[PDB]
Design a protein around this ligand. Structure first.
Ligand SMILES: *[C@@H]1O[C@H](CO)[C@@H](O[C@@H]2O[C@H](CO)[C@@H](O[C@@H]3O[C@H](CO[C@H]4O[C@H](CO[C@H]5O[C@H](CO)[C@@H](O)[C@H](O)[C@@H]5O)[C@@H](O)[C@H](O)[C@@H]4O)[C@@H](O)[C@H](O[C@H]4O[C@H](CO)[C@@H](O)[C@H](O)[C@@H]4O[C@H]4O[C@H](CO)[C@@H](O)[C@H](O)[C@@H]4O[C@H]4O[C@H](CO)[C@@H](O)[C@H](O)[C@@H]4O)[C@@H]3O)[C@H](O)[C@H]2NC(C)=O)[C@H](O)[C@H]1NC(C)=O
Ligand SMILES: *[C@@H]1O[C@H](CO)[C@@H](O[C@@H]2O[C@H](CO)[C@@H](O[C@@H]3O[C@H](CO[C@H]4O[C@H](CO)[C@@H](O)[C@H](O)[C@@H]4O)[C@@H](O)[C@H](O[C@H]4O[C@H](CO)[C@@H](O)[C@H](O)[C@@H]4O[C@H]4O[C@H](CO)[C@@H](O)[C@H](O)[C@@H]4O[C@H]4O[C@H](CO)[C@@H](O)[C@H](O)[C@@H]4O)[C@@H]3O)[C@H](O)[C@H]2NC(C)=O)[C@H](O)[C@H]1NC(C)=O
Ligand SMILES: *[C@@H]1O[C@H](CO)[C@@H](O[C@@H]2O[C@H](CO)[C@@H](O[C@@H]3O[C@H](CO[C@H]4O[C@H](CO)[C@@H](O)[C@H](O[C@H]5O[C@H](CO)[C@@H](O)[C@H](O)[C@@H]5O[C@H]5O[C@H](CO)[C@@H](O)[C@H](O)[C@@H]5O)[C@@H]4O)[C@@H](O)[C@H](O[C@H]4O[C@H](CO)[C@@H](O)[C@H](O)[C@@H]4O)[C@@H]3O)[C@H](O)[C@H]2NC(C)=O)[C@H](O)[C@H]1NC(C)=O
Ligand SMILES: *[C@@H]1O[C@H](CO)[C@@H](O[C@@H]2O[C@H](CO)[C@@H](O[C@@H]3O[C@H](CO[C@H]4O[C@H](CO)[C@@H](O)[C@H](O[C@H]5O[C@H](CO)[C@@H](O)[C@H](O)[C@@H]5O)[C@@H]4O)[C@@H](O)[C@H](O[C@H]4O[C@H](CO)[C@@H](O)[C@H](O)[C@@H]4O)[C@@H]3O)[C@H](O)[C@H]2NC(C)=O)[C@H](O)[C@H]1NC(C)=O
Ligand SMILES: *[C@@H]1O[C@H](CO)[C@@H](O[C@@H]2O[C@H](CO)[C@@H](O[C@@H]3O[C@H](CO[C@H]4O[C@H](CO)[C@@H](O)[C@H](O[C@H]5O[C@H](CO)[C@@H](O)[C@H](O)[C@@H]5O[C@H]5O[C@H](CO)[C@@H](O)[C@H](O)[C@@H]5O)[C@@H]4O)[C@@H](O)[C@H](O)[C@@H]3O)[C@H](O)[C@H]2NC(C)=O)[C@H](O)[C@H]1NC(C)=O
Ligand SMILES: *[C@@H]1O[C@H](CO)[C@@H](O[C@@H]2O[C@H](CO)[C@@H](O[C@@H]3O[C@H](CO)[C@@H](O)[C@H](O)[C@@H]3O)[C@H](O)[C@H]2NC(C)=O)[C@H](O)[C@H]1NC(C)=O
Ligand SMILES: *[C@@H]1O[C@H](CO)[C@@H](O[C@@H]2O[C@H](CO)[C@@H](O[C@@H]3O[C@H](CO)[C@@H](O)[C@H](O)[C@@H]3O)[C@H](O)[C@H]2NC(C)=O)[C@H](O)[C@H]1NC(C)=O
Ligand SMILES: *[C@@H]1O[C@H](CO)[C@@H](O[C@@H]2O[C@H](CO)[C@@H](O[C@@H]3O[C@H](CO)[C@@H](O)[C@H](O)[C@@H]3O)[C@H](O)[C@H]2NC(C)=O)[C@H](O)[C@H]1NC(C)=O
Ligand SMILES: *[C@@H]1O[C@H](CO)[C@@H](O[C@@H]2O[C@H](CO)[C@@H](O[C@@H]3O[C@H](CO)[C@@H](O)[C@H](O)[C@@H]3O)[C@H](O)[C@H]2NC(C)=O)[C@H](O)[C@H]1NC(C)=O
Ligand SMILES: *[C@@H]1O[C@H](CO)[C@@H](O[C@@H]2O[C@H](CO)[C@@H](O)[C@H](O)[C@H]2NC(C)=O)[C@H](O)[C@H]1NC(C)=O
Ligand SMILES: *[C@@H]1O[C@H](CO)[C@@H](O[C@@H]2O[C@H](CO)[C@@H](O)[C@H](O)[C@H]2NC(C)=O)[C@H](O)[C@H]1NC(C)=O
Ligand SMILES: *[C@@H]1O[C@H](CO)[C@@H](O)[C@H](O)[C@H]1NC(C)=O
Lengths: 452, 148, 148, 148, 48
């Protein structure tokens, strides 16, 4: 009937931990080309097997909205870019005034331009005129025959990305260290927040590929379920929506121009990658979707949201109607040049009371981008030569309501993509890092010899 | 992937099990606590000059925090006389204003997480003298009694 | 500010007191020795990119030196058979050419600092065999005597 | 330079000697293992601003790896009940499908390196339960038997 | 004094060709040059 309080080492116990995590990815030798965007050569290789072990009858909280690993996982992505850029060539001798007008074509479809222009050679007092081919968005006018200036020249500098590095995304496994542990949730009908009844223990994320995408996600994870999707608080418009599928449908973005290029030397070791002559047809950037699958995956996105605005209510859709050029349209990367398509055909339907027909979506291509909504030194994207063709696997989307109007009568809303880290909530919502508190005192009757 | 059921049970696999069950699985925790070498290799499993990529040094910050919080934890054990030994018995009685319930009522009834939650407030104060009345004045004794 | 006299006495508060007094206050030193986590948090108590400000890494150098000199100190204890135990008795006699004075004459008369000063020269040589004659050949014994 | 023969024998000086000889020289290894302070000083034994020369931080990576692999090694000892004590006896029998030879046949006949080579394959599997059958279920006993 | 101590009757392999300390010992020498240079004056107004 006497009680001592005795200690134990290694008690299964944990605390909401705030700490910095690390990446682990299986190493690609890949001696052909080199230097990946993020993984580079520094991420540690994943172990031959990462051990996954089920925590039985355990139920533990999850809140992906004040989740920190996203604020980290973009804190990185912004960062090392600004060190994958710094070793590459600095493009300030180019903000020169460099005359052009339209490109050879029967006047049909700011398609593109072709300027001919001053430049500095390797030698100093020596100069040279040569020509290149830009796009409408990279330059803006002021005054003669005619001639414009580069859109960013207004406010920021530029460092062109080294074409040796490539921005093809690869799986990244974020890792919690010893003294901590991440953990995954494992019920399919789990919505955005709440304790998860089915839980199993991981230490390093599954392979997350950091796709740079605005208003949509794709080539991501896919739940075995019917696409049930969450907000910070749906009741309010201002906070976004983040869908992601159950069976992906295909997306193939295209522009069939074989660009040519030409290395030209600005000075000591600096070689600017001018776009060269087009050989072949003139062809705009676009992207195909067969509606047959789109409207029916849509169809299941239709019915489930219903469970939050009544089973008897309107729903709606049309195109993005707010913001800047970059986010109002599908910003992303494909093979080296970035796309911007009005998603007009897609947001085309109203579904109330419950032969190939492939969508085709016009896009424009950029080269000089102030990404992640960060003013400062821009990046000039080198062109891409020959054809291009990128297949794809739609998994999700991002949306935001418009707010004030009559309740439940006919409220409207529209995709927003106000911030990107909603890209990170896409597949970082199973995971949650946690501390080890491994030592516990507890009462039993044992006690060793009182030495007196 | 598909669940394989060959090994039992694993690191924190007894977190959903009562304290008595987990009290026997204290070692599937003690090895995974410190080991930052099994999972991170002194040399990797040539264009680059040096490796001060921030994969490098904020991995580097992590490894020491892995040890120091262990190292200060196991010092607490060095304070209470249990260094190489995972469980530890204890001399000063428990006056139960910290918990009114029984002995069976915890090891069979609750789990470890489900026991810290309730005395998480009384935690610091107890560690005040699980050494003083237990070890600070356990060995002036055998100082004064191995005196002869 | 104005002195408050509620707690007694504190870290090195027995440095001005004789060895006997401080010999009882060995723990108000042992916890403050290693703990570089209580005072420095793994995450802080957004314009910046990464934290390689030299507040970052020369704090980082400090934390390991905090542990390693502890860690090599407590290894010396692991050499002499005292790991989890702060004081330690000893077998090889003291031949007193290192100090000619008595037993009362130090614990009641001097303080710890006032004892190192005088044998600071004889310090390294003693640590030569407070293990060899004490522990290096303490356990080939119970090797050769638990032999049966 | 020219060989001086005053000290005997030294760190790994018993690597070419049989296990019995080296079994007595376990400490001329244990002190040289961790000590990264005797050889590297917290402050040096003014034009420069800060010391992030890569002599600085890849010395810095080395010091922790020096400790952590020690620190996880000595945790294995904390798993098996030997923390402050270099040799350790053992309870679960050796079934000798790992080596068919005798007791004299190793300490007098071979050396330590010449013993790992042969059971380097059986190494991990043994460490599975030199604690479980030895210590994991050594102290639920004195849990259940100091019960009274 | 750096202590040198003879390992008696010990015989141990050596292959200086896949030896790594050289790949390190030049990995350095290339490196810190590119930081003993960077603080010094940049000579591009001279290609005139
Ligand atoms: C959703 O999921 C989809 C499914 O995966 C994604 O689809 C992916 O889309 C990306 C594009 O965004 C593709 O990447 C590119 O694919 C090209 C087509 O691959 C064809 O060829 C394959 C075989 O050849 C490849 O592999 C061999 C090794 O096996 C390699 O040697 C070879 O070079 C080539 O890479 C074949 O198996 C496929 O089926 C296809 O038929 C591929 O050509 C691309 O490689 C280019 O581009 C990348 C990106 O910059 C570079 O890193 C590469 O090094 C390479 O560029 C080099 O070659 C060019 C050839 O003209 C040169 O112009 C370049 O300048 C460069 O050459 C320089 O450097 C060389 C190396 O130093 C030197 O030798 C040269 O002399 C020059 O100096 C690229 O891989 C994916 O392939 C595609 N997936 C799949 C499965 O195909 C989709 O993107 C996802 N959606 C989203 C949004 O991400
Ligand atoms: C977005 O874009 C993507 C990508 O473009 C679209 O997805 C692709 O869609 C394709 C369908 O149009 C599909 O590929 C096709 O497969 C056909 C076969 O399917 C039919 O036959 C099989 C049985 O064989 C049935 O099971 C099936 O149901 C169909 O009935 C091919 O017929 C297609 O074309 C042929 O040419 C292509 C080149 O484009 C070849 O790659 C292909 O293999 C076909 O045949 C030649 O090649 C094979 C070997 O590859 C030979 O065996 C054969 O005899 C032909 O001979 C040539 O090659 C041999 C050497 O092997 C040589 O000796 C000979 O002389 C010839 O040179 C076509 O390939 C894709 O799989 C599919 N991709 C993906 C990722 O799904 C997507 O729909 C788009 N989405 C939208 C919304 O637009
Ligand atoms: C992404 O891609 C999508 C896909 O198209 C784009 O969607 C388009 O977005 C633009 C926004 O810029 C929309 O334009 C707006 O359209 C209205 C309507 O235009 C009326 O006004 C003009 C005068 O300005 C009239 O000339 C038009 O005349 C049409 O109708 C009469 C008969 O009624 C006929 O005589 C004409 O020939 C013409 O009819 C022909 O076409 C129609 C179908 O379009 C057909 O019914 C008919 O039989 C003929 O075939 C028309 O009455 C326009 O008023 C708005 O005005 C703004 O610009 C004008 C200057 O042009 C200013 O005066 C005004 O103040 C505003 O500033 C807009 O131009 C367009 O409707 C829309 N299309 C679709 C299909 O959705 C996205 O814009 C793209 N996004 C990006 C970022 O690129
Ligand atoms: C980048 O931005 C800069 C900023 O200004 C742009 O400026 C241009 O600078 C150049 C040099 O300063 C200007 O050159 C002018 O040339 C005309 C006519 O030149 C013709 O006739 C000349 C004889 O009169 C002849 O020498 C010329 O060239 C011959 O020789 C070369 C070899 O050396 C050979 O290649 C040719 O085939 C000829 O054999 C050429 O035939 C000239 O009249 C201009 O007037 C100046 O000099 C006269 C006195 O001669 C003086 O009265 C004027 O007041 C003025 O000082 C001047 O020499 C060029 O015109 C500028 N651009 C424009 C649009 O006017 C630059 O062009 C931008 N891009 C680049 C550099 O790529
Ligand atoms: C997108 O756009 C790009 C354009 O950049 C296209 O790329 C082109 O694709 C074609 C394939 O149809 C390639 O042709 C092939 O070339 C290889 C290798 O060439 C060798 O063999 C051919 C004979 O087969 C031969 O012509 C080549 O010889 C050159 O030099 C000889 C002198 O030594 C000369 O006799 C010969 O004719 C040729 O030179 C001629 O051209 C130059 C100017 O171009 C002229 O000044 C000179 O006097 C000559 O007239 C060489 O030995 C062959 O094996 C193939 O059979 C095929 O001929 C192009 O090489 C390739 N171009 C580039 C720049 O990459 C993409 O295909 C296109 N894709 C799509 C999807 O549309
Ligand atoms: C070829 O290049 C010329 C430019 O040199 C393009 O002409 C441009 O045509 C557009 C209309 O198609 C003009 O836009 C105008 O903008 C004002 C507001 O700024 C607006 O009020 C007008 O209603 C009109 O939309 C533009 O001024 C004009 N550029 C000029 C005159 O310099 C031409 O479109 C190009 N070819 C093709 C096929 O686009
Ligand atoms: C752990 O210990 C803490 C500290 O004693 C306990 O917290 C205290 O809990 C009581 C509730 O019984 C709180 O009192 C409340 O105060 C308001 C006025 O502020 C009063 O109106 C209520 O009726 C009630 O009395 C008290 O504020 C709170 N103090 C702190 C610092 O948290 C806690 O209950 C203990 N937990 C367990 C599980 O034992
Ligand atoms: C600690 O041990 C050291 C080493 O034995 C002692 O240092 C030594 O102290 C003596 C003083 O008794 C010094 O001797 C002096 O030498 C000069 C000639 O250089 C001579 O003229 C003086 O009359 C005197 O004999 C000796 O140099 C010195 N050696 C060193 C290396 O410091 C020290 O005294 C000991 N301290 C204590 C508190 O025991
Ligand atoms: C340490 O344990 C490993 C694992 O059991 C032993 O390695 C194995 O050694 C045998 C040789 O007795 C190898 O078998 C050979 O296989 C080929 C066919 O691949 C066959 O034609 C030969 O006649 C022979 O049977 C076996 O491959 C090899 N396995 C591995 C994974 O290494 C090793 O012998 C043990 N070492 C000591 C010193 O006990
Ligand atoms: C695109 O989606 C498919 C699933 O719809 C992913 O898996 C492929 O599945 C098809 C059949 O459904 C298989 O034939 C392929 O072999 C699968 N591919 C792989 C790589 O496993 C596919 O991975 C997705 N594409 C990506 C992620 O690039
Ligand atoms: C749905 O969106 C599409 C555009 O994606 C609209 O399609 C237009 O339809 C007319 C036929 O009346 C065609 O002549 C046009 O070429 C189409 N426009 C484009 C840009 O392709 C369609 O009208 C929309 N339907 C509704 C009710 O919103
Ligand atoms: C039914 O529809 C009305 C408006 O048509 C709406 O106000 C009401 O909330 C709906 N009820 C349910 C249960 O969805």
């Amino acid at each position: 009937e006497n009680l001592w309080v005795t200690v134990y080492y290694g008690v299964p116990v944990w605390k909401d931990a705030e700490t910095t995590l690390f990446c682990a990815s299986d190493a690609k030798a890949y001696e052909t080309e080199k230097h990946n965007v993020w993984a580079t050569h520094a991420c540690v290789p994943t172990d031959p097997n990462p051990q996954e072990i089920h925590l039985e009858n355990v139920t533990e909280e999850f809140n992906m909205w004040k989740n920190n690993m996203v604020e980290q996982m973009h804190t990185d992505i912004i960062s090392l870019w600004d060190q994958s850029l710094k070793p590459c060539v600095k493009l300030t001798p180019l903000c020169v005034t460099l005359q052009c007008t339209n490109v050879t074509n029967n006047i049909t479809d700011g398609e593109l331009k072709n300027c001919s222009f001053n430049m500095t050679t390797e030698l100093r007092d020596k100069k040279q005129k040569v020509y290149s081919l830009f796009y409408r968005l990279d330059v803006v006018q002021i005054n003669s025959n005619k001639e414009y200036r580069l859109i960013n020249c207004n406010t920021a500098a530029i460092t062109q990305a080294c074409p040796k590095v490539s921005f093809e995304p690869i799986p990244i496994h974020y890792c919690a260290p010893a003294g901590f542990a991440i953990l995954k949730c494992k019920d399919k009908k789990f919505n955005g927040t709440g304790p998860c009844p089915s839980v199993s223990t991981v230490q390093c994320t599954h392979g997350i590929k950091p796709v740079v995408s605005t208003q949509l996600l794709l080539n991501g994870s896919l739940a075995e379920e019917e696409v049930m999707i969450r907000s910070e608080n749906i009741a309010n418009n201002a906070k976004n929506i983040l869908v992601q599928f159950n069976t992906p449908v295909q997306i193939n973005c295209t522009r069939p121009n074989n660009n040519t290029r030409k290395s030209i030397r600005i000075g000591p070791g600096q070689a600017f990658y001018a776009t060269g002559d087009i050989i072949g047809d003139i062809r705009q950037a676009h992207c195909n979707v067969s509606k047959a699958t789109w409207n029916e995956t849509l169809g299941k996105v239709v019915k489930q949201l219903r469970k939050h605005f009544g089973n008897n209510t309107i729903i709606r859709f049309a195109n993005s109607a707010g913001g800047d050029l970059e986010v109002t349209t599908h910003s992303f990367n494909c093979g080296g040049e970035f796309f911007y398509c009005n998603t007009s055909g897609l947001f085309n339907s109203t579904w109330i009371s419950n032969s190939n027909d492939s969508i085709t979506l016009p896009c424009r291509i950029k080269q000089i981008i102030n990404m992640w909504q960060r003013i400062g030194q821009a990046m000039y994207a080198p062109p891409i030569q020959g054809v291009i063709r990128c297949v794809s696997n739609i998994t999700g989307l991002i949306l935001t309501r418009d707010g004030g109007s009559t309740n439940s009568a006919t409220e409207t809303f529209r995709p927003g993509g106000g911030d990107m880290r909603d890209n990170w909530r896409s597949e970082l919502y199973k995971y949650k890092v946690v501390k080890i508190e491994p030592l516990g005192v507890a009462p039993t009757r044992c006690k060793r010899r009182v030495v007196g | 992937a598909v669940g394989i059921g060959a090994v039992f049970l694993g690191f924190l696999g007894a977190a959903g099990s009562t304290m008595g069950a987990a009290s026997m699985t204290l070692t599937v925790q003690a090895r995974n606590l410190l080991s930052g070498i099994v999972q991170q290799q002194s040399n990797l499993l040539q264009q680059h000059l040096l490796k001060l990529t921030v994969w490098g040094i904020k991995q580097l910050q992590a490894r020491v925090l892995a040890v120091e919080r262990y190292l200060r934890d196991q010092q607490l054990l060095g304070i209470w006389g249990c260094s190489g030994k995972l469980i530890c018995c204890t001399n000063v009685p428990w006056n139960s204003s910290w918990s009114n319930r029984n002995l069976s009522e915890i090891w069979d009834n609750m789990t470890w997480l489900q026991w810290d939650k309730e005395i998480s407030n009384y935690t610091q104060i107890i560690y005040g003298l699980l050494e003083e009345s237990q070890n600070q004045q356990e060995k002036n004794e055998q100082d004064l009694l191995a005196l002869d």
